């Protein structure tokens, strides 16, 4: 601990998401990184789906500072060249060793496999299938996709991850099968997480009557999920950007996801009717206007605005937290709370303190008087002891505390009516009375 | 009701000790022994036109302490000498202490601020000495169970 | 349901038997002191 | 309120008198339990909606 | 000694980094300095055109400042109690072991050492976060808690005091950063950070 | 025992949420918690960054504090 210098100088020139990648780079079912520099040290091949998601997330205006990576044991990987291309590069990492290679699509695949053999890779069709000799592959340059495979199903893998660690809010999955997406949505809806997914499907733009898409699949069951259609969905996994534009946003302001800029994504190239169809499906898009880009309306799968969902979740979590913290602290000194008319009213202050008085200050919760001729102020009602049933007394639990709130509304659309006059406008009405 | 007895031991006024300069005071009046007050309230409120509210913390905590003594008491002599002592030599301060038998204590330094009104009549009079105390934060130390 | 329980008394049966109870606070022995008032950290 | 009931000498059996034993002293109380669980029915709305005004 | 003799312990000032005429800069290398430090053998370095003592650690590893402060507090507490007791016993009216006479020791102690230490800044005060005050504490037992042998010997035991101490600054480290090109735009999330 | 030995029953205080240093938070899942609650096997759940006992029930379903 000796410090040879009295003064020395270097002169050196929020909620957390969770991404369920498929790999074998570490044994734990989950890990937390503070940057992609930490990921590469674990052997993550640059351009691999997990690396792409992290780098997209960290660059947002509201980016978090901890990204959680899941793990479903990887089975194999593929590299398809169905899209034509002329230079091609691939980043492939063996154990502790990262390397790159160079290069009609079938001949390209054969050449790539031979160069890899120059690990295990075999050409077939337009794609190369890669397996690890008891290995991660990432984007280099070219139109080629990268598709990984695993023998573990998400619907059953997720419970182990949540059991290992529950300190995360958002949920993104690499496996873009419709069954996997639906299972993830169902799991999130039950464990109070937020499900997010990009999609490169084309049925989204289809006429307003063709229900052949995962978007309509989810809408029918009325699940909640932030579904967006994107071109680079399965080449860059732009869920990272969407989360990075929302991660650090405080729900208490009631601010809107509408019209925000999300680096990494690209403007949507459909026509007006395609936009109208996508809107009919609640498949949010990313427009480009007046020299920039903008998300649009952030509607969830069930049609409800994402802002209301986030606000409700925040209120629920913080009310539970605030009640539990007071109750435990009050029971740790002896003097535990008791079911009596002289002790229950304090819950009014307990609730009015933590969530409500911050929501009002930040402006999420509305207040005042209306015209309906009724006040907008929050209301709290607590029952007396006389109204508590015998079974409730026996179980020592209180029911039927009721709360009521009002919510603000961010502005989305505005319309104007201009009028131009060329000649002399005529005299106005001169009835200078007080209008009845 | 006997389930709300606020004092299980009767409050005996003789337990209230007062030490000035290290000697115990004695010879008190008929009704009230001491009174402790502050001069300034704790914080200042500056409210704006539209309702913006901001608060400030006070930095003058001086108070005044009154000490009722029968004019025949011997302690009147010690205080009277002390006044002249300080007026000439310029040493005014002197430790002050109070024991809150079943209340709040006090422990600070103070000085004689004013001398009372001496009156002679058909009854033994009274004197109200003012002992300005430099700092007047009451202490709950005598109370048990203060978590 | 209500909990029924009984209590009893007997002429010679002490509640605690003859348990010695907690150890007492000892009186220190009488020794010589050099310092009228000594402080030691 | 807790209650205490004590028998009279006329009600004590002669056998109990001979044995020098007192029976059937009874006490009654009520226990004041504590609270464990709480449930709430919060609701979020974009706005708010019979006028009898007669004492029930 | 000449660099420390007249230093008042109540300020809690540190022997570190003082200049001591007569001595000469130490000529060992970095590893020699590290070894000497491992032995608590204080040295006299020469830096930036002068000289400087280093860290004044004692043989047992404790800083010399704490030792001097403790000795000063001990001596002055004994002095202050004895002086009051004798002066109070010279007029007759000697002190007595009663609940009505013992509390005055609170003022006796609070006067001489403590109120000078606070003014000079050696003793710390205020509130922490631990969520507890730093203020000095004095506790005196009542008569009911005094054993028979203690009454017979006419000596009072178990007066307890408690203090906190300041810390002179020895070492400091900095992390500079230089930029050559145009720095990029910062985050524009103008919220109140949660 | 260290969390209930000293407080007298005159307060009617229960054992529901008292912290017990030395115990290790329960690890099972919610289904396992529901299972255990049926057998009256109290657990020490770790919540909100702390540890908390749960409901202190005896073998026959009765609460400990009444006994």
φ, ψ dihedrals at B68, nearest 5°? -90, 125
At A294 the three-state DSSP class reads: strand
Q: How many CB atoms lie within 10 A of CB D25?
A: 11
Give the CA distances from residue E42 to residues A144, E16, E53, E58, in Å, rounded to whole numbers and listed in that order: 68, 10, 7, 9
Instruction: Determine the residue among E92, E107, E114, E133 to mutate to test chain B binding: the one whose Cβ has the most chain B Cβ atoms within 10 Å.
Output: E107
SS3 E125: coil
Instruction: Tell me which residue of E115, E7, E113, E15 sits closest to E70, measured CA to CA.
Output: E113
**B70 with B124: CB under 8 angstroms?**
yes
Please give the structure tokens belonging to residue E183: 């720095």
Give the residue from chain E lying closest to B94, CA to CA: E111
Q: Is E180's Cβ below 8 Å from some Cβ in A? A: yes
Q: Report CA A194 to chain centroid distance, whole Å.
A: 6
- Length reported for chain C: 41
Is F10's Cβ below 8 Å from some Cβ in A? no
Give dist(CA A327, CA B24) in Å, integer: 48
DSSP E111: I
User: Residue A2 burial by CB count (10 A; 0-12/13-18/19+): exposed, middle or buried?
Assistant: exposed
Lookup: tokens for C5: 């329980």
Three-class HEC string of F4-60: CCCCCHHHCCCCCCCCCCCCCCCCCCHHHHHHHHHHCCCCCEEECCEEECCCCECCC
* Nearest in space to A119 (alpha carbons), one of A107, A108, A105, A129: A129
- For the record, the structure tokens of E187 come out as 């985050």
Please tell me the distance from the alpha carbon of residue E30 to that of residue A5, in angstroms, as a whole number: 10
Which of chain B's residues have a Cβ under 8 Å away from the Cβ of E88?
22
* CA B83 remoteness from chain centre: 18
Separation in Å, CA of D48 to nearest CA in chain A:
7
Closest chain A C-alpha to E105 CA, distance in angstroms: 34
D31 to chain A: which residues are within 8 Å by CB? none
**Strand stretches in A192-315, DSSP E:** 194-199, 226-229, 286-287, 294-295
Is residue A314 within 8 A of residue A250, CB to CB? The reply is: no
Cα–Cα dist A226/E100, whole Å: 76
Size of interface D-F (CB pairs under 8 A): 16
Chains that touch D (3 or more CB pairs under 8 A): A, F
Closest alpha carbon to A373 in D48, E127, E183: D48
Alpha carbons A184 and D6: distance in angstroms, whole number: 71
Nearest in space to A146 (alpha carbons), one of A9, A28, A45: A45
**What approach was used to elucidate this structure?**
cryo-EM
Q: Which candidate in A331, A337, A354 is best for mutational testing of the F interface (most F CBs within 10 A)?
A: A331
From residue A187, alpha-carbon distances to A225, A282, A303 in Å are: 11, 21, 19
Secondary structure (H, E, C), B49-86: CCCCEEEEECCCCCEEEEEEECCCCCHHHHHHHHHHHH
Indicate the pairing of strand B127-133 with strand B63-69.
antiparallel
CA-atom Rg of chain D in angstroms:
29
Tell how many helices (H) and how many strands (E) occur in chain A: 13, 19
Q: Which of chain A's residues have a Cβ under 8 Å away from the Cβ of E187?
A: 61-63
| Residue A296 CA, distance from chain mean position | 15
Element (H, E) at A170: strand A170-173
d(CA E116, CA E76): 11
End-to-end alpha-carbon separation of chain F, Å?
15
What is d(CA F31, CA B27) in angstroms, rounded to the nearest whole number?
76
Helix or strand holding residue E150 (H, E): helix E148-153
CA count, 13 A, side-chain hemisphere, A412: 12
- Locate A264 and state its tokens: 């990494």
The helix/strand/coil state of D7 is coil
Can you tell me the distance from the alpha carbon of C26 to that of C29, in angstroms, rounded to the nearest whole number? Answer: 9
Cβ(E81)–Cβ(E105) below 8 Å? yes
Any chain E CB within 8 A of the CB of C34? no
Return the DSSP state at A72: E
Strand stretches in A7-126, DSSP E: 7-8, 18-20, 22-23, 31-33, 67-69, 72-80, 89-94, 97-102, 120-124
Contact criterion met (CB below 8 Å) for A343 and A388: no
| Nearest alpha-carbon partner for E114 in E151, E78, E154, E73 | E73
- 8-state DSSP, A353: I
Contact predicate F34/F23, CB 8 Å: no
Measured distance CA(A280)–CA(A208) in Å, rounded = 6
CA angle D16, D17, D21 (to 5 degrees): 55
Residue D25 sits at φ, ψ, to 5 deg, of: -90, 125
The DSSP H or E segment spanning E86 is helix E64-89
CA A246/CA A61 separation, integer angstroms: 8
* Alpha-carbon distances, residue B68 vs A314, B29, B74, B123, B133 (angstroms): 61, 5, 13, 16, 16
Residue B108 neighbours by CB under 8 Å, 6+ apart: B95, B96, B133, B134, B135, B136
Nearest-CA residue of chain E relative to C33?
E155
Task: Give the DSSP letter string of A45-71.
Answer: PTT-HHHHHHHHHHTSTT--S-EEE--
Question: Which of these, E43, D36, B52, lies nearest to A361 by C-alpha position?
Answer: B52
Q: State the virtual CA torsion across A261, A264, A268, A269 in degrees, nearest 10.
A: 140
Are F14 and D31 within 8 A, CB to CB?
A: no
Neighbours, chain F (3 or more CB pairs < 8 A): A, D
Interface of E with B (CB under 8 A): 84, 88, 100-101, 103-104, 106-108, 110-111
Question: Quick one: tokens of B88?
Answer: 């000439």
CA A166 to chain centre: 16
Interhelix angle A214-221/A178-191, rounded to 10 degrees, is: 30
d(CA E46, CA F17): 61
Q: Do B22 and E100 make contact, defined as CB atoms within 8 angstroms?
A: no
User: At A324, is the secondary structure helix, strand, or coil?
Assistant: helix
Residue linked to tokens 């009451």: B138
For B8-50, the three-class secondary structure string (H helix, E strand, C coil) is: CCCCCHHHCCEEECCEECCCECCCCCEEEEECCCCEEEEECCC
Angle, CA A183 vertex, CA A177 and CA A189 arms, to 5°? 135
Shortest distance, CA D29 to any CA of chain F (angstroms): 12
A174: three-class secondary structure by DSSP: coil
Neighboring chain B residues of E86 at a CB cutoff of 8 Å: none
Instruction: Tell me if E112 sits within 8 A of E79, measured CB to CB.
Output: yes
Q: Which residues of B touch E110 (CB under 8 A)?
A: 95, 107
CB F34 within 8 A of CB D54: no
Maximum distance among all Cα pairs of chain B, rounded to whole angstroms: 63
* Touching chains A and F? (3+ Cβ pairs < 8 A): yes
Between vectors from CA A115 to CA A109 and to CA A120, what angle results, nearest 5°? 80
Write the residue in A324, A325, A334 that is nearest to F13 by C-beta: A334
Q: What are residue E165's phi and psi, to 5 degrees? A: -130, 150
Neighbours of A143 (CB within 10 A): 13
Q: Distance of CA E121 to CAs A60, E118, E125, E168, Å? A: 49, 5, 9, 11
Q: Which residues in chain A are closer than 8 Å to D36, comparing Cβ atoms?
A: 395-397
Hey, which residues does A173 pair with through a beta bridge?
A20
Using CB atoms, list chains with 3+ pairs below 8 Å to chain B. Answer: E
Resolution rounded to one decimal, in angstroms? 3.1
Interface mutation target, options D33, D40, D46, chain A, most CBs of A under 10 Å: D40
List residues bridging with B138 in a β-sheet.
none
Helices (H), A10-104: 36-40, 49-58
- Residues written for chain B: 147
Q: Name the residue among A129, A19, A20, A113 with its Cα closest to residue A76.
A: A129
Locate the chain F residue with the closest alpha carbon to D29.
F66
Handedness of CA E82, E88, E91, E97 (dihedral sign): negative
Determine the 3-state secondary structure of A251 from DSSP.
Answer: helix
Helices (H) and strands (E) in chain E, counts: 5, 5
Q: Which residues from F are below 8 Å from A328, CB to CB?
A: 17, 50, 52
CB-CB under 8 Å, C36 with E85: yes
From A7, A12, A14, residue closest to E172, measured CB to CB: A7
Q: Which long-range contacts (CB under 8 A, 24 or more apart) does B51-54 make?
A: none
Cβ-contact A133, A1 below 8 angstroms: no
Interface-testing mutation among A336, A338, A340, A395, with chain F (most F C-beta atoms within 10 A) = A336
Residue A327 touches partner D, C-beta closer than 8 Å? yes
Residue E189 is nearest to which of A8, A61, A362, comparing CB atoms?
A61
Position of tokens 């307060």? F11
Give the integer Cα–Cα distance in Å for A336 and A317: 23
The pair phi, psi for residue A338, each rounded to 5°, is -140, 150
Beta pairing, strands B63-69 & B94-98: unpaired
Orientation of helix A178-191 relative to helix A154-164, angle to 10°: 30
Asked if F21 is an interface residue toward chain A (Cβ–Cβ < 8 A), one would say: no
Q: Do C36 and E153 touch (CB under 8 A)?
A: no
The DSSP H or E segment spanning A326 is: helix A306-331
Report d(CA A208, CA A203) in Å as an integer: 10
Write the DSSP symbol of residue E91. T
Q: Taking CA B118 as the corner, what is the angle to CA B112 and CA B121, rounded to the nearest 5 degrees?
A: 155
List the structure tokens of A362.
């930040």
| Out of F7, F11, F17, closest to residue A328 by CB | F17
């Amino acid at each position: 601990e000796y410090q040879d210098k009295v003064v020395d100088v270097e002169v050196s020139l929020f909620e957390t998401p969770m991404f369920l990648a498929m790999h074998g780079n570490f044994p734990e079912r989950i890990r937390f990184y503070v940057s992609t520099a930490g990921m590469v040290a674990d052997g993550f091949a640059v351009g691999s789906p997990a690396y792409q998601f992290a780098t997209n997330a960290f660059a947002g205006n509201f980016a978090p500072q901890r990204v959680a990576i899941g793990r479903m044991s990887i089975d194999s990987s593929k590299v398809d060249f169905t899209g034509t291309t002329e230079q091609v590069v691939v980043n492939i990492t063996l154990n502790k060793v990262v390397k790159a290679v160079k290069i009609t699509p079938a001949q390209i695949a054969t050449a790539l496999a031979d160069a890899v053999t120059a690990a295990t890779a075999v050409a077939t069709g337009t794609y190369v299938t890669v397996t690890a000799v008891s290995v991660s592959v990432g984007k280099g340059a070219g139109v080629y996709k990268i598709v990984n495979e695993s023998s573990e199903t998400v619907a059953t893998v997720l419970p182990s991850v949540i059991a290992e660690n529950h300190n995360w809010y958002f949920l993104a999955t690499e496996a873009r099968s419709d069954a996997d997406i639906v299972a993830a949505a169902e799991f999130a809806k039950a464990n109070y997480k937020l499900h997010i997914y990009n999609s490169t499907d084309v049925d989204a733009y289809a006429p307003e009557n063709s229900a052949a898409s995962v978007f309509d699949t989810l809408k029918s069951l009325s699940y909640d999920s932030l579904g967006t259609s994107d071109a680079g969905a399965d080449v860059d996994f732009t869920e990272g950007s969407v989360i990075g534009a929302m991660a650090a946003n405080d729900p208490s302001y009631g601010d809107s996801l509408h019209l925000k800029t999300m680096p990494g994504m690209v403007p949507f190239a459909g026509s007006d009717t395609q936009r109208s169809n996508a809107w009919s499906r609640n498949a949010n898009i990313y427009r480009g206007l007046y020299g920039g880009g903008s998300y649009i309306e952030g509607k969830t799968s069930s049609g409800q605005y994402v802002d209301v969902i986030r606000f409700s979740h925040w209120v629920k979590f913080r009310m539970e937290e605030s009640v539990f913290a007071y109750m435990k602290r009050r029971s740790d000194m002896g003097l535990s709370m008791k079911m009596s008319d002289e002790d229950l009213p304090v819950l009014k202050s307990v609730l009015m303190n933590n969530p409500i008085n911050i929501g009002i200050r930040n402006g999420g919760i509305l207040t005042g008087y209306d015209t309906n001729k009724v006040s907008y102020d929050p209301t709290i009602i607590i029952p007396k002891r006389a109204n508590i049933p015998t079974n409730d007394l026996a179980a020592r639990i209180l029911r039927d505390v009721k709360v009521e709130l009002v919510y603000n509304n961010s502005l989305h659309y505005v319309k104007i009516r201009a009028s131009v006059v060329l000649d002399r406008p005529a005299g106005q009405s001169t009835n200078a009375q007080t209008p009845m | 009701n006997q389930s709300k007895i606020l004092t299980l031991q009767a409050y005996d006024p003789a337990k209230v000790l007062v030490f000035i300069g290290g000697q115990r005071v004695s010879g008190f009046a008929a009704d009230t022994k001491i009174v402790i007050t502050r001069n300034n309230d704790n914080i200042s409120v500056h409210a704006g036109v539209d309702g913006e509210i901001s608060n400030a913390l006070s930095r003058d905590n001086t108070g005044v302490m009154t000490l009722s003594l029968q004019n025949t008491a011997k302690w009147n002599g010690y205080l009277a000498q002390w006044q002249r002592q300080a007026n000439v030599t310029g040493l005014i301060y002197l430790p002050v202490q109070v024991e809150g038998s079943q209340g709040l204590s006090l422990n600070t330094i103070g000085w004689i601020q004013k001398q009372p009104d001496l009156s002679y009549g058909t009854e033994v009079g009274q004197m109200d000495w003012e002992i300005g105390v430099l700092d007047a934060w009451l202490s709950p130390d005598q109370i048990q169970g203060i978590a | 349901p209500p909990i029924g329980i009984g209590a009893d008394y007997d002429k010679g049966v002490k509640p605690g038997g003859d348990d010695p109870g907690l150890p007492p606070k000892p009186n220190p022995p009488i020794v010589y002191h050099d310092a009228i008032a000594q402080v030691c950290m």
